[PDB]
């Protein structure tokens, strides 16, 4: 019964990621005590 109109994105999943969607802090190493760059401590 759905409209015969333009279908964007010719696939539809409700669980697109299983390992976790990429955020910037993926593939970034951690630092001792979480120090920022050029933190004087």
């Amino acid at each position: 019964g759905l409209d015969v109109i333009r279908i964007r994105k010719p696939f539809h999943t409700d669980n697109p990621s299983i390992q976790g969607q990429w955020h910037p802090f993926t593939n970034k190493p951690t630092t001792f005590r979480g120090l920022r760059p050029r933190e004087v401590q």
């Binding site: 109109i5 333009r6 279908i7 010719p10 696939f11 539809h12 999943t13 299983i18």
Partner: protein, 160 residues
Amino acid sequence: SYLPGYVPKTSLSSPPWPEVVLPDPVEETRHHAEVVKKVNEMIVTGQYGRLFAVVHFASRQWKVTSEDLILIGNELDLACGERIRLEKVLLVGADNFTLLGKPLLGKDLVRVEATVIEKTESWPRIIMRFRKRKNFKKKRIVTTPQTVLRINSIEIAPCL
């Protein structure tokens, strides 16, 4: 005593990229057997959930999972609500492990199950050709047939 072939350490007497030594083949094949056996016993016990697959189908590669929808741009000579098996599985993977075919995985190893749920047509596409000052003007309307498949299940078997 300098070897006949020694170079002093200059800026470009040696390659910029670091030297890389590869592990010996015998130890590496034992390590491969250990890793494969580990992944196989994960498959046996069932320490996985929500598998995904990269499946070759209708000249395209679809990254499908379970309970999914895909839109094939041609008719598939199948009745609606019909359960079929997708076979050309380029990749299957879960959290913590993936399996890679070369280039196709084993049909004993992985099954994809799909269901024809809709046989439809596309929205009308316009083909218009126009060349100017030459009275050149042509219009056509096409409607490509389409098939909506629901990916039901992705099942793996312990065969590594």
